[PDB]
């Protein structure tokens, strides 16, 4: 994985912006507590064998002297190991916040929550990539920082310490054995992941014959069915997935061999290397004039060799985890590339859109879907603020395609388009959109709260806007202007359309779409809404099947879904 | 959980039927290798400290004497340790097979795969209750057998051995400290699972505001959208789920306290109790007149106290796992009771069904849906073998209720019914049912090839049956009478209906239902099928919307869907 490091650097520069920040501060703090954690671990090794030497030296003075050193130093030892884990966890959180604040300026920039989900197919689940995969990526880049550099400082320190303690060949025949036996064991157990997938395949298709029996049992039951679908499930279970007995038999024999040359013969090698200074009376540098320092020197060397040996089991596992980290940075870099692709207008684009006021002419503009299939050839019409348009047709596949192009939600396949910008086009579907929040932020949704007051507005004006739609009892009944509850369930039917009309009245757009929305609204207040929009100047694009709504539309556009149209 | 043991006993008698079987044999073998594993663990404790005493006694004779004992005994130690794991795994598999061969005799008895699915509501997913929860239950009843009795034999053995080695108060002040400090730690860390759910709630609703943004982005993008839905997700993240920082701060302080009184102060207590025979120079029974055998006695007592202390951490965890085992035996006993309930008929039954030949009369019998509704007040008609019946109506909700009652798939809501038993009623839906297996078994499905010969039939006759349906080229195209690949994909169209008609011809039932099946079959083939059925005498209950198919039905039944019928 050569490009994995190159891709990981780009993400790292996002999560470590400058050289003076808390993330840089935590990185130094963890590195300081990684070094000081190894010293505390060695100090326990040296002090621990001095409590034990004083116990069996039968001196109460030596036992008290070295037990009190342990008691005095354990508040500091516990501080080091536990403030290192605090620094790791805080770095995981700081990394996640740094990435999220970068993956959400690109995501929610112009229309990218929409284009990346319902206009391209690069990412199947956008949501799972911005909340779930971001958390696991950050939890693995500092996990690899710790799990790789923690059992590496002591590897260097124990090799440096076991040398000049059991000789240079001491922690080298242990390295040779742990590596040679590790490679041989891994090669020997090759058919473990080979028959793990076979078990998973047999498990996966044992649930299939069960699910196929249930979601299809209607026909199996009329004619008897059982005793034939019973032997189908039985054969998949009794015959197919009972290699577990062959899998269990292999794991027993493999376990019998890997528990000898990696668990008991590894210690036999450990005894041999450590015992060289002791079973050699002509050893000048080390023990030659020692009486009970032989005891402390052995268990210091014996405990160091055990920690040096078991640090490889954690540096090997850390390298294995790097493959998972390589998988995560692939999806993050894929998501980052996709977000940067759509932010420039990529996923088409030949046509030009020029922002104009009260001009919506579609002069020589096709109606191609984002794939490219043109369904309307020669759209050419203009309407002005003051004349309504009724859209007619059997709603096949083109009714909900002119609006998407109109709102710039879909690409323009050539031609010149004039229309107001995003803030003036309004679309009201059959079920209106209710916002997660209070009752006040359902009338003023696309506007915020702080910038709502600067428009010279008041809650009384919000009430009278909401009163014009024949809805004044909900405000008092629900709990007030700041009552927070789910408005998709606590509201059902006409009141949603009434609140949508109230929002439209409050915002006062230039053009509005009423696609099969006014279906549970009284006809008198419907005419009132039409008159209000006409007198204030809210042009409406009415889509309806009711024949009585044909008196407030100066123009009329019809789509057949076959290729032609009349205006 | 008093009844949990009572329920677990009933399941155990299923998986341990008699006192002479493999499960009894494995249970004794595991118990034998559980006792002999503790002896091998103690023998390593005693032998291990004799290699170390020989090393630092600087005698090569003692090092070789006790290293060769370790080398000679390590094939047997590994054999004992890995034959226990083999016995556990084999018991897990033998338990799963014993339960499955009991949960599938009750499941596939008469219509219970069908009744439990869409006639009861006790189990929502019966599929993941006979393959997935059965495996995890058996994997936990013997995991509890090992994980509870393994760190209990050594608990008794180490207490018996540490006593008379460091005195009776030795492994009692350690029991007192571990139990008392364990309770204090658990009580102190009460607000860990209390704020774990708060994090999960905040995590779960951070994914909600993301998913609600995606599955609803169509209307959001038509407004300006962002800067209002951007601050909704931001507030759920930046404000709400940063209790992690308060969760991280608590875990640092809580960890700082539990790493002192349970990790470093536990050893300080361990030093104090073990050291009593040594610093007491007047200890008469123990090492009063000994050489430096205090070395071997200390580390034998020191290693035993560490294994005795750490055997409690596994007996505590074993008890915690019992709660999960209590959950599993609830679903297994719930499934077992539902299986036994339906085998007699429960979920109704007022009417009586008496088997007969060629008569399907419905004198004074309603067609009630097995819920609290009735769609036909009283059906009353009879047909004779040889007279086809056409069923009319726009198949709303009553057409697919006469057939279910006819096949005994639904209960009889009073009245007297005469009809042939399960093997003679036939129902062919719009898409026929194809069976996992060869091409031969798609013609003879509810029969087996083993019982296919007892009818005096041959593959030539099967081909002849396949010839009458105007479909004979598929046999030699797919690979013969043994082509295995699934037939819901290779066949797409009228071939499935042709094979269903071939199966109908082969089985020669008394009555058959042709509910909207013949929709991709040429009219000549329809006439041939009807003529062949009339000649042989297979009465047909035809459901069709074609007016031309009205000349070969002596009778005619009409379900208007209002509550009455026309026969
Ligand atoms: C500073 C400079 C001067 C020099 C700097 C140079 C440095 C940086 C070099 C850096 C090298 C690294 C970076 C290179 C890595 C490349 C490699 C990763 C790639 C592969 O392709 S490689 C694939 C498999 N590679 C394995 O590496 C798995 C095996 N990894 C294991 O870690 C063990 O195999 C296991 C833990 C499973 C062993 O089993 P454990 O029992 O679990 O550990 P152990 O058996 O090895 O112990 C050892 C022994 O110490 C002795 N000992 C203990 N206590 C004693 C006592 N009281 N008295 C006397 N002796 C004692 C024994 O008695 C015995 O102790 P026990 O542990 O058995 O009790
Ligand atoms: C046979 C008859 C005569 C009598 C039969 C009677 C029997 C059956 C009675 C049966 C009792 C049972 C059934 C009742 C259970 C009821 C209970 C479950 C209900 C609760 O409501 S209870 C809720 C929490 N209950 C805990 O129980 C958690 C804490 N459970 C732990 O298990 C550990 O706490 C942990 C694993 C965290 C170990 O803690 P750790 O600190 O991580 O290890 P450790 O330190 O404790 O080991 C101990 C020390 O031995 C000394 N020792 C070691 N090496 C030495 C050396 N070389 N020299 C000298 N001394 C040494 C130390 O120095 C040191 O070990 P080292 O740290 O030195 O290595």
Numbering used by the authors:
A (entry chain B), B (entry chain A): 60 to 406, 428 to 647
What's the publication's text?
Human ABC transporters ABCD1–3 are all localized on the peroxisomal membrane and participate in the β-oxidation of fatty acyl-CoAs, but they differ from each other in substrate specificity. The transport of branched-chain fatty acids from cytosol to peroxisome is specifically driven by ABCD3, dysfunction of which causes severe liver diseases such as hepatosplenomegaly. The overall structure exhibits a two-fold symmetric homodimer, with each subunit containing a nucleotide-binding domain (NBD) and a transmembrane domain (TMD). The helices TM4 and TM5 from one TMD are swapped to the opposite TMD, i.e., domain swapping, which is a typical feature of type-IV ABC transporters.
The phytanoyl-CoA-bound structure of ABCD3 was solved with the addition of 0.5 mM phytanoyl-CoA during sample preparation. The phytanoyl-CoA-bound ABCD3 adopts an inward-facing conformation open to cytosol, similar to the apo and substrate-bound structures of ABCD1. During structural refinement, we observed two symmetric cryo-EM densities in the TMDs that could be unambiguously fitted with two phytanoyl-CoA molecules. Unlike our previously reported substrate-bound ABCD1 structure in which each C22:0-CoA molecule crosslinks two TMDs21, each phytanoyl-CoA molecule solely binds to one TMD. In detail, the hydrophilic head group protrudes into the central translocation cavity, whereas the acyl tail is buried in the fenestration formed by TM3, TM4, TM5, and TM6. Specifically, the adenine ring of the 3′-phospho-ADP moiety is stabilized by Glu111 from TM2′ (TM2 from the other subunit) via a hydrogen bond, in addition to the π–π interaction between Tyr330 from TM5 and the adenine ring. The 3′-phosphophate group of the ribose forms a hydrogen bond with the main chain of Thr326 from TM5, and the β-phosphophate of the diphosphate forms a salt bridge with Lys322 from TM5. In addition, the pantothenic acid moiety forms two hydrogen bonds with the main chains of Ala321 from TM5 and Gly372 from TM6, respectively. The branched chain fatty acid tail forms hydrophobic interactions with Val215 from TM3, in addition to Ile374 and Val375 from TM6. Site-directed mutagenesis combined with ATPase activity assays indicated that the chABCD3 variants with single mutation of the substrate-binding residues (E111A, K322A, Y330A), supplying either the polar or non-polar interaction with CoA, displayed significantly decreased substrate-stimulated ATPase activity, compared to the WT.
